[model samples]
Target: SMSVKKPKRDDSKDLALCSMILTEMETHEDAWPFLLPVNLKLVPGYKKVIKKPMDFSTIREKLSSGQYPNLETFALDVRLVFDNCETFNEDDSDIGRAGHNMRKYFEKKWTDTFK
Candidate 1:
């Protein structure tokens, strides 16, 4: 069944970060709430510059916090990046499917970290 195989790229870093973020998020979940949409943009094209504090920590807070009925904020963030990239990314050529892969990995392997 060819759902569709575009190509492959190395986003192991994304997986690794999501794993660590989820692990840490779980650790901090019971403490408080997760992210509170600050001056944060979910655009994939919006590559963060050499800035000060980033909302990713805030995102982690929201993600870890027991504020939602479903705790899939991390993947949502990834998906947001994907959508933004799909829209405005300059190199929007027929490269390896990016977001789908990352989101797919997040969905498949994220829960492995926990029960």
Candidate 2:
């Protein structure tokens, strides 16, 4: 007897935009590590609230709305995050791996979705 497993529900559609943002943030070289934790926490909720597909306008609206304490500070933090991620290594230390999986998740999602 051949048994077929049902198709897994696609959560990808819901996570697409956040995944894209994470990808962009990681490769940014200035925002990956600093933003990884924040992104990990927020992305799931962002996926739910955002209705449209990924795009500039969507990003502008979400970021410009001042969800963080201050946009300028947030931007700086994002850059720092990336800087940290760049130097992170498996043997580095706890800080090195604090949010490594989340960073890689966003990176892979971004790459898969965008290209």
User: Number of the top candidate by TM-score?
Assistant: 1
Worst 10 residues of 1 by lDDT: 29-38
lDDT of each: 0.45, 0.44
TM-score of each: 0.34, 0.31
What lDDT is reached at residue 82 by model 1? 42
**Cα miss at 97, model 2 (Å)?**
1.8
Candidate 2 ranges beyond 4 A from true positions: 1-16, 19-80, 85-91
Clashing pairs in 1: 34-61, 34-62, 35-62
lDDT of candidate model 1 versus the reference: 0.45
lDDT of 2 by residue, 1-115 (tens): 2697787755444334553564565454433334323343555554444332232233344555644343334334434443444443343555455446545654574456545
User: Which pairs clash in the backbone of model 2?
Assistant: 30-79, 31-78, 31-82, 32-82, 33-81, 33-82, 34-81
Q: Residue 16 lDDT in model 1?
A: 49
In Å, residue 48's CA in model 2 sits off its true spot by 37
Q: Give the total clashing residue pairs for model 1.
A: 3
TM-score of model number 2 = 0.31
RMSD in angstroms between candidate 1 and the native structure over all alpha carbons = 13.8
Instruction: Kindly give the stretch of ten consecutive residues in candidate 2 with the minimal lDDT sum.
Output: 50-59
Model 1 quality (TM-score): 0.34
